[PDB]
Symmetry: C3
Subunit: 473 residues, 3 copies
């Protein structure tokens, strides 16, 4: 006859919003947030409350509490809206994308976005496009590799992977090749990458304090943040202005990208398409690129795992060449290697929901209005949910059909508000890795675990030196 | 009966208020719209208060006819003091634009056979054609890599690198590798140097050296630093061809400047001066009406398709004989006449008249500067029916002096024929492979910065024809 | 009757006036002309007032022959204090140039078989040849696009990117893609780092650590920042090959450094140190006499055509077997000897003598620094008739040719530099005529190495 306890009975985080914000001002970031939160779960248990003074905040981990959170997902799930991002759009007179929307406005936008961005039918249309970029990546790498006497190229792949994600995402969204794969990076691509870096750095700085504090504590950080958005929006509008003009004179019969479908359907206003198209263009660069580099590293660290994946990719090489759409079903262990990477290195770190109805999490009453934050780092590294958590084991995802481990894999979220660019990111990662495995051996002397850094998204601190050795002629 | 010079409507402006506005705004970007409004208010003729020197402003072709008859064996122009100041300073000879009297005529008569003449045009036409061919080829390559089989972009950077490439090949017989590749540091710094020099020319153009030396001392340094980059690029070209020709005198045609150096009718210093005037002079002037033709064809698809049909039928004869492009493409030649009617890069035709004359029944004395305004002339509804209508056919239906964007007589633009060939051939190869399109259906705001240039470059879609 | 050390003519200038001009002018650009004048006015031998330490300046090959006879098992060099200072600071081992005694001999004998030896030269010769072939091929492409079938340019940037490419391929078996393409940020920053290091070497060289600490404190930072860039580029090179070889030991030849790492006769730290000396050392040194050969051939068309006829006849055998380039081209090898006679990159040969010796009938005691001046030596009218004449034939008609030094301590990159020069020149002569109106001698500038002040405008005219 176990009694449900009140919200206040919950272990409280030893910290405070004030020390945190002064420290964030001093250090100009919160690079150690994941290790601070991870330690607190190791000390306080699977559930703890954060003292935001007035607002209630619950920190959870464990699929257990994710299932219950999905149960309370209303027809309009809520998320703690990102004030500095909203501040920019309100300033320059822009509409908000799905991520920065809540309530009916979010649902209207999402339902018109899902069929052309997330849906399986859409994935079958852009899969061959993404495949062509992935094919061009390995073929350019092969060209560089064969010019060296040892038939291998040792390098920092990070710059190439970013220019791959920019190229593949541009082709999938707009049906336009930027010429960044296999060539020198452009001023446009480098300034965009840098603008995204500055935007996230300044997001972390203006994030954990009210506009009443950040207006005088960090006035320079606001200008810095808005200048970063000015560059992000310059690049993004250039994209949309090109496709909008092209489609105005000729409505193509064939598939020419995601955004072409949205503009042709005209279910959303030009302003709403512009807003959501901006979220997709900018959003697909830093997010897909970091777990891709981590998969390449983890495979260079685990040659045993790498060779299992290579054998799969080489056997299924023929069918995928004919129908690139087969890559989804034909490569289970490579799909599972991405699940393993997103467990160890979750680039999204948290799943947040301002809960709309009272609920019970870990025998504590969580009232309506509480912001429930699921910590994907602690959830993934938990030894009880994942045996030998530190082991890179893609096999742990194969025979879990009826293991009740449905909520073990949540790096893209859950329900209606789950990541829109989930399917596009997965396709970009699968296909790059498939074509790399077919032609090269990934190697490294850097066996040491990479220190992750929190800069809005969980990114590695250092990029390791990866050797790409040619297999065949 | 005959009205005095003073009886003329006078411009409401001031020789000082304009001088201070140029000081404050660092340019006179709206000069064309200011002059156009004044003709709409004061009539076809008005005088400008220069506070001593006489200045007349005209806009009629009957006055353009009166001005050519009073042109001497040595036509006179108001010499550009800041440009002359730089050449005096660094010890350079003056090119045909900055010369007057016998020195101009000696230089011009040795320049015309190799630069302007029809026989010269037949020699560099195949050279220019190769660059134009390489432009569309590179554009096609970029276009075909996109899913919609089209490339929407700001063409302005490409068109400038085309004019630099085509002009370099025509003058020096040297490919710079700017067409279909990434712009070089040399080309970008040259383009920028030209923009500054043009900007700083306007800033010192309307005030005497006596005022501009203490009012705008930084603008003089800025202007001379700009010329230092322009002359650095130009001399590099000259010292390459001069060394190449010193060891081997080629049998075949290897450019305009090669002919001038081989003939040796003009001193090395005179060739250097005029060669500088051709290299620098061909980059911006040709590029602006080319972009305007591309835009005007993207807003007039009806006109564009008429030109395309002409270019596609005459495609074969121009492929075997590029020199046939001149006679085989009349409508496309007339479309350029139409770009220059509405968008005159030269804006004005100036002459310091040598003898008294009577323009619009007003006495214009000798020594009076006569300034023809090409913007207003081309926008006169009586001379050009529906003047704000891109109708290249209006140059075919003809039943004289209506087309003067390059000037008239002996002093007419020395680059007229090379510029025409560069425009005519780029457009021919673009029409054969692409459809030019734009949602920007609004007239571009033109900017005066010594030459009439567009303020904004529109977004042009180049759709592959098949 | 042998005279004492003190009886020798003394250099007129004091060490302090020289030290103050190096402070003021931020270099010693006229050193070669100052030393040349002193040999002209004093004789073939003169001592330098170091205010205690003994220093002898020689210019005759008869004296080189003698300086060699005392060399000993471990020849001693006047160690370059600012270079050693950087290594000691960042915790690096010293390369064979900055080493002395047994440590130098241990390093040298493990380096000679894979860097200097004839068997090694036969292994990297085809590699270097491929880069030289790519250079002329790229130049031909640019040349043929011009109406006069010629390209007039400043070759200096291309020659430097050739030496960087060829040396990288020979040492690491890696193509950087610098030949026939646009220069990279890595290559430009490296070139600039080497320039700043050689300039700040001269600035800190002629004064001790004590004076340079307060006279030129900014110059030390400048010098160490330059080395930081040189070492960044060099470690990137070695980190790549070390990782590649760790997973696969290649059966075929994949460069000089691959052999050193596979043999593992030297410690990783010693390989790192010597590999740094080879990577950085092969850029400026080889590039300056190469540009000087191209210039001297553009002013001597008569000599150029003699070399062209040789290169065109021997074109077939060198195409099949590139390793034949060494023996098949005697006049072209002699043209390099001729360029290094007039324009010696490494102006001096220095030795701190371990035993007493006699030079020009003067007693030179043990401990004495003996500096051979290669500029005056190669400009002596008695050893070389009509010395100003660029005549490679003189080398065909006994210590006369010593631009790489002598004995055990002679230039390690001597045979790699020769191969890089010979082959580039062979492929240029085959396809182009080198021409110039600049018929005036280039003013040389001492910047640790003897480099030209100005790069002339050279026309490369296609033959067919
Ligand atoms: C195409 C752009 C894009 C890419 C690529 C992308 N995302 Fe997202 N993601 C979104 C959008 C849009 C949302 C907003 C969800 C909403 O409110 O509808 C989102 C939301 C999320 C959320 C929170 C969802 C929730 O239920 O709270 C997570 C976690 C997430 N993304 C993780 C990722 C990860 C992991 C990757 C790749 C490694 C990724 N995303 C790549 C567009 C992107
Ligand atoms: C290759 C060089 C070059 C090009 C290209 C060039 N010009 Fe000229 N232009 C000149 C020179 C030189 C003069 C001076 C001629 C003289 O005094 O003998 C000149 C003079 C003029 C004049 C004054 C002529 C007069 O009679 O007063 C006008 C107007 C003119 N150019 C218009 C143009 C236009 C319009 C274009 C292109 C659409 C153009 N020019 C392109 C070299 C050039
Ligand atoms: C691959 C690198 C490399 C290149 C290229 C190179 N050197 Fe050397 N050089 C060295 C090294 C290493 C030493 C040190 C030799 C020692 O201490 O044993 C050296 C030493 C020398 C010495 C002193 C020899 C002595 O006995 O005193 C001279 C002289 C010299 N080099 C001249 C040259 C000249 C001239 C060139 C170019 C034309 C050149 N080097 C190119 C690596 C190089
Ligand atoms: C306490 N805290 C909350 C968060 C948080 O809300 N998120 C989601 C972040 O990761 C993400 C996952 N997917 C896409 C993203 N995006 C981007 O990277 C991006 C860039 C520019 C725009 Cl205009 C929109 C986006 C979106 C939002 C689309 C972020 C992690 C981080 N820390
Ligand atoms: C009240 N006012 C008079 C003018 C005027 O004199 N002109 C002529 C300007 O247009 C032009 C036409 N053709 C060639 C040109 N050139 C250039 O663009 C150019 C650039 C560098 C040099 Cl070193 C020489 C020239 C020349 C002069 C050759 C200009 C318009 C402008 N405003
Ligand atoms: C009174 N004085 C002595 C000298 C002197 O010792 N030398 C040798 C200099 O020329 C040379 C010949 N060969 C190779 C060289 N190198 C370089 O250029 C170089 C550059 C960077 C490094 Cl990390 C090592 C080297 C080495 C040392 C390899 C220099 C001239 C100069 N002035």
């Amino acid at each position: 006859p176990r009694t449900v306890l009140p919200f206040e009975a919950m272990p409280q985080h030893p910290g405070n919003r004030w020390l945190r914000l002064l420290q964030i001002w001093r250090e100009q970031g919160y690079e150690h947030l994941h290790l601070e939160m991870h330690q607190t779960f190791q000390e306080l248990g699977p559930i703890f409350r954060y003292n935001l003074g007035g607002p209630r905040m619950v920190c959870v981990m464990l699929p257990e509490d994710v299932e219950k959170l999905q149960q309370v997902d209303s027809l309009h799930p809520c998320r703690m809206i990102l004030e500095p991002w909203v501040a920019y759009r309100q300033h320059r007179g822009h509409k908000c994308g799905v991520f920065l929307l809540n309530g009916p406005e979010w649902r209207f936008n999402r339902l018109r976005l899902n069929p052309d961005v997330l849906s399986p039918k859409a994935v079958q249309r852009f899969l061959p496009m993404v495949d062509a970029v992935a094919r061009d990546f390995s073929q350019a790498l092969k060209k560089k590799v064969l010019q060296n006497a040892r038939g291998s190229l040792t390098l920092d792949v990070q710059p190439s992977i970013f220019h791959y994600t920019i190229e593949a995402s541009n082709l999938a969204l707009f049906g336009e090749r930027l010429g960044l794969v296999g060539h020198s990076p452009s001023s446009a691509s480098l300034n965009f990458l840098h603008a995204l870096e500055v935007m996230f750095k300044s997001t972390v700085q203006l994030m954990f304090m009210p506009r009443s504090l950040s207006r005088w504590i960090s006035p320079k950080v606001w200008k810095e943040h808005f200048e970063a958005w000015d560059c992000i929006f310059q690049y993004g509008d250039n994209c949309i202005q090109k496709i909008y003009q092209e489609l105005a004179f000729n409505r193509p019969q064939h598939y020419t990208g995601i955004v072409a479908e949205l503009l042709l359907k005209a279910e959303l206003s030009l302003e709403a398409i512009k807003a959501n198209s901006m979220e997709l263009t900018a959003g697909s660069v830093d997010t897909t690129a970091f777990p891709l580099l981590m998969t390449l590293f983890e495979l260079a660290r685990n040659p045993d795992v790498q060779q299992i994946l290579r054998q799969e990719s080489l056997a299924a090489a023929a069918s995928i060449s004919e129908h690139p759409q087969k890559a989804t079903t034909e490569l289970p262990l490579l799909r599972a290697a991405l699940k393993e990477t997103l467990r160890l290195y979750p680039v999204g770190l948290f799943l947040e929901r301002v809960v709309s109805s009272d609920l019970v999490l870990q025998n504590y009453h969580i009232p309506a209005g509480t912001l429930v934050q699921v910590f994907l780092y602690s959830l993934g590294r938990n030894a009880a949910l994942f045996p030998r958590p530190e082991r890179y084991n893609p096999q742990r995802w194969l025979d879990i059909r009826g293991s009740g481990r449905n909520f073990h894999h949540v790096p893209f979220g859950f329900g209606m508000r789950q990541c829109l660019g989930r399917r596009l990111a997965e396709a970009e990662m699968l296909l790059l890795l498939h074509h790399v495995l077919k032609h090269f051996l990934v190697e490294t002397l850097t066996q040491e675990d990479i220190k992750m850094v929190y800069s809005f998204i969980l990114r590695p601190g250092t990029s390791p030196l990866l050797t790409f050795r040619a297999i065949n002629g």
